[PDB]
Amino acid sequence: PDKLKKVLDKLRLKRKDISEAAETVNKVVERLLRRMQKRESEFKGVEQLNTGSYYEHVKISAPNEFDVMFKLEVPRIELQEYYETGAFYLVKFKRIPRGNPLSHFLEGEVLSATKMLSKFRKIIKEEVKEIKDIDVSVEKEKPGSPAVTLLIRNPEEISVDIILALESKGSWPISTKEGLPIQGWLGTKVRTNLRREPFYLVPKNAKDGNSFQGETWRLSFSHTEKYILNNHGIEKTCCESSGAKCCRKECLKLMKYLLEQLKKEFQELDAFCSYHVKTAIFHMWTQDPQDSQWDPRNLSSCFDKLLAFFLECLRTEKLDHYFIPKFNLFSQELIDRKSKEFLSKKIEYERNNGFPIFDK
């Protein structure tokens, strides 16, 4: 019984002390939604987007910290690329003959994330005021993040970041045309079906000056990423009861956990987040698509090749977004070369010493 298997045991046992906070969170948010869906507003159609809630699906956060996405269908979007990489978008509209319901959130031709979020925040504050069963308030707006974060004080303080996402049922942006390269792994029928589902727009400022600040959006495929994580095998029975299990998720978990415990010890690693890990392993799953290449009896070999792949992404400063191939998450504009070299030396140290970081 090696350290890797014991770390996995530790991770799922540590998720036991999350489930009670998670039940609190689910009933707060479904009450808040049901309230928002009864009230008359631009957000009456809001719904929770289910993006998975296990360790593999969630961002790295403290045990009492949660994230949920509120989707809002927005018809007849007209996207304009803000970056040639596909990293950001301005949201305009095609002709809407009966009137754009979001007309009043516009700034010029562009949907203002600032205007939309401000009312999004206001309505929630009012509906959260009217929930008595449970002590729920809303944290004061933070610089930077667009999140409307609930403070649940059922004895222990629990935080919930609510993310507003626009849902568009139009075709996927031109920047995704050659993305989602699953043809040799999940197949062409799956790829065709996934690209027929909606996509989502999350408000996010770019670090580039005053112009269009508060008016920029980034793409989100969290619904697709959940499907892939839960349908990850070449065989349809992979990890099912009449099938064989692989170590794909286990590798993702170990890698997320390695980064998280490195990040809590080195501010140098601030630019790195769990999404870089998920992106890297999406590519490894495309490069090594056979279930037998992720056999559970080869966990440490599979973990190590994932590490060697990540290391090579750092060394060549290239990690293509899995859905937007022009969008390099490891470009120098986004992460200094010195942060990659620092992370590389931290990983090689952990790799060649039995992962001491895993013993705390």
Residues belonging to the binding site for ATP are: 53, 225, 256, 274-278
Query: Please, which residue, 23 or 240, has the CB nearer to Zn ion?
Result: 240
Scanning 153-161, 212-220, 243-251, 313-321 for contacts with Zn ion by CB under 5 A, the matching segment is 243-251
Nearest approach in angstroms of CB 226 to Zn ion is 15
Main-chain dihedrals φ then ψ at residue 287, nearest 5 degrees: -75, -35
Nearer to Zn ion, 65 or 295 (CB): 295
Of 186 and 239, which has the nearer Cβ to Zn ion?
239
Asked whether the beta carbons of 166 and 217 are under 8 A apart, the reply is yes
11 part of the interface to Zn ion, by CB under 5 A: no
DSSP code at position 183: T
Work out how close the CB of 253 gets to Zn ion at its nearest, in angstroms, rounded to a whole number: 13
Q: How far is the CB of 185 from Zn ion (least distance, A)?
A: 12
R_g (Cα) of the chain, nearest Å: 21
**Residue 248 and residue 231 in contact, taking contact as beta carbons nearer than 8 Å:** no
Cα–Cα distance measured from residue 166 to residue 102, given in angstroms and rounded to the nearest whole number: 11
* Among 138, 150, 239, 357, contact with Zn ion (rule: CB under 5 A): 239
Q: Is residue 302 a contact residue for Zn ion (CB under 5 A)?
A: no
Contact predicate 113/203, CB 8 Å: yes
d(CA 223, CA 51): 5
Among 60, 124, 180, 246, binds Zn ion (CB under 5 A): 246
Residue 186 touches Zn ion, criterion: CB under 5 A: no
Say whether residue 244 binds Zn ion (CB under 5 A): no
Nearest CB to Zn ion, comparing residues 220 and 293: 293
Are 60 and 256 within 8 A, CB to CB?
yes
Q: Count CB-CB contacts under 10 A for residue 115.
A: 16
| Shortest distance (Å) from residue 235 CB to Zn ion | 9
Going by C-alpha positions, the residue among 50, 83, 73 that lies closest to residue 170 is 73
Q: What values do phi and psi take at 8, rounded to 5?
A: -60, -45
**Binding mask 194-233 vs Zn ion (x if CB under 5 A, - otherwise)?**
---------------------------------------x
The residues of the shown chain that bind Zn ion, judged by CB under 5 A, are: 233, 238-239, 246
